[PDB]
Amino acid sequence: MNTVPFTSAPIEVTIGIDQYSFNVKENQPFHGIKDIPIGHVHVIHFQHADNSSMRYGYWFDCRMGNFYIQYDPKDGLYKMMEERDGAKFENIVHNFKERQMMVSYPKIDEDDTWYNLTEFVQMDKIRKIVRKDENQFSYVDSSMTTVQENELSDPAHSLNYTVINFKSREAIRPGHEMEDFLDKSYYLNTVMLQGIFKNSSNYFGELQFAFLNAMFFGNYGSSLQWHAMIELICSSATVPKHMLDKLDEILYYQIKTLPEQYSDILLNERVWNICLYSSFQKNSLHNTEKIMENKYPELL
């Protein structure tokens, strides 16, 4: 039901909307995307035809405002903007729909892929990882570094993922060195779940957001965060049964959706081999283990 109109499309670009994508020609009469499902976060993303280095996009939730895209010929990108005049916006969207100048969000009725990838992902949590408080939507690109990457530069353009470091005082209680390093349960359950995330839903939301930024932007720091959050659960002997069953579902859909041809740059051999075959949870991820063994046996 929701719509993200475009003022125009002056430069040739591949436009992504969640897991879908389509090519727009230079000066093609393209005026946006309609029938966007209410109830989920969405990501609109861009790769310029003349420069694939320009790979960037916007997380948004149409419940939080009227958003549109307009090309900026000075900064050389498609920008998301908020229209505060509801009647002007409704009038623009009605005209473009009447003239059929919009692509329809192409959801198959049977298909829960997007829900399954974004089940725990909330815009309010996105806006804490990506700090730009004057906008209700969040810009991400291929080059943005994480707070953790910046510790090992510009802080305002960083991804504020929760720092996970297995060889840190936060991860290891004085006097429990071997126990805490070989069994990460205290770090997962006390420090991360009880301490920082408050519940498993926020932990999964960050994990899901990190995977989506990895997949949609090739964001290397996001890929690191996704694998660290998997490894922290798999490396804990004590995990609530509901979290294990949910993680198996989460990872199954992530592995299902990953483009076959990016498996080599998006998946860390060491982490997946450790997680599926060595870890405490080696026998807890039945669905994930089966799709990985059938889709990516080379990695394993």
Partner 1 sequence: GAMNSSNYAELFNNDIKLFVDDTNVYRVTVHKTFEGNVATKAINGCIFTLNPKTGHLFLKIIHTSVWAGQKRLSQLAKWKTAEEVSALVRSLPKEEQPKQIIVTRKAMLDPLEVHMLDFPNIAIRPTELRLPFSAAMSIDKLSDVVMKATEPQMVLFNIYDDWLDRISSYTAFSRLTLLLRALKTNEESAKMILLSDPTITIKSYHLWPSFTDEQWITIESQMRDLILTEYGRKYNV
Tokens matching residue 256? 């299902």
Compute the distance between CA of residue 287 and CA of residue 243 in angstroms, rounded to an integer: 14
Compute the distance between CA of residue 55 and CA of residue 15 in angstroms, rounded to an integer: 10
Compute the distance between CA of residue 171 and CA of residue 167 in angstroms, rounded to an integer: 7
Q: With respect to partner 1, which residue has the nearer C-beta, 84 or 167?
A: 167
Candidate ranges 59-67, 88-96, 128-136, 168-176; the one touching partner 1 (CB under 8 A): 168-176
Q: What are phi and psi of 44, to 5 degrees?
A: -105, 130
Candidate ranges 163-171, 185-193, 224-232, 254-262; the one touching partner 1 (CB under 8 A): 163-171
- 122: closest CA among 30, 178, 190, 198? 198
- Write down the residue that tokens 């725990």 correspond to: 120
Is residue 87 a contact residue for partner 1 (CB under 8 A)?
A: no
Supply the minimum distance, in Å, between the C-beta of residue 182 and partner 1: 8
Q: How many CA atoms lie within 13 A of 183 on its CB side?
A: 10
The overall longest dimension of the chain from CA atoms, in Å, is 70
Among 98, 110, 156, 167, binds partner 1 (CB under 8 A): 167
Among 91, 95, 104, 168, binds partner 1 (CB under 8 A): 168
* Buried-exposed string 162-176: b where 16+ CB fall within 10 A, e elsewhere: bebeeeeeebbeeee
Is residue 84 a contact residue for partner 1 (CB under 8 A)?
A: no
Tokens matching residue 266? 């998006």
Candidate ranges 25-33, 176-184, 204-212, 242-250; the one touching partner 1 (CB under 8 A): 176-184
Q: Which residues inside 178-217 make contact with partner 1, applying CB under 8 A?
A: 178, 181-182
Q: With respect to partner 1, which residue has the nearer C-beta, 129 or 172?
A: 172
Could you give the 3-state DSSP secondary structure of residue 196?
A: helix
Is residue 172 a contact residue for partner 1 (CB under 8 A)?
A: yes
Q: Is 261 exposed, middle or buried (0-12, 13-18, 19+ CB in 10 A)?
A: exposed
Is residue 241 a contact residue for partner 1 (CB under 8 A)?
A: no
Is residue 20 a contact residue for partner 1 (CB under 8 A)?
A: no
Among 26, 85, 111, 177, binds partner 1 (CB under 8 A): 177
Supply the minimum distance, in Å, between the C-beta of residue 63 and partner 1: 45
**Site size for partner 1, by CB under 8 A?**
9
Candidate ranges 7-15, 53-61, 86-94, 162-170; the one touching partner 1 (CB under 8 A): 162-170
- State the residues that interact with partner 1 by CB under 8 A: 167-169, 172, 174, 177-178, 181-182
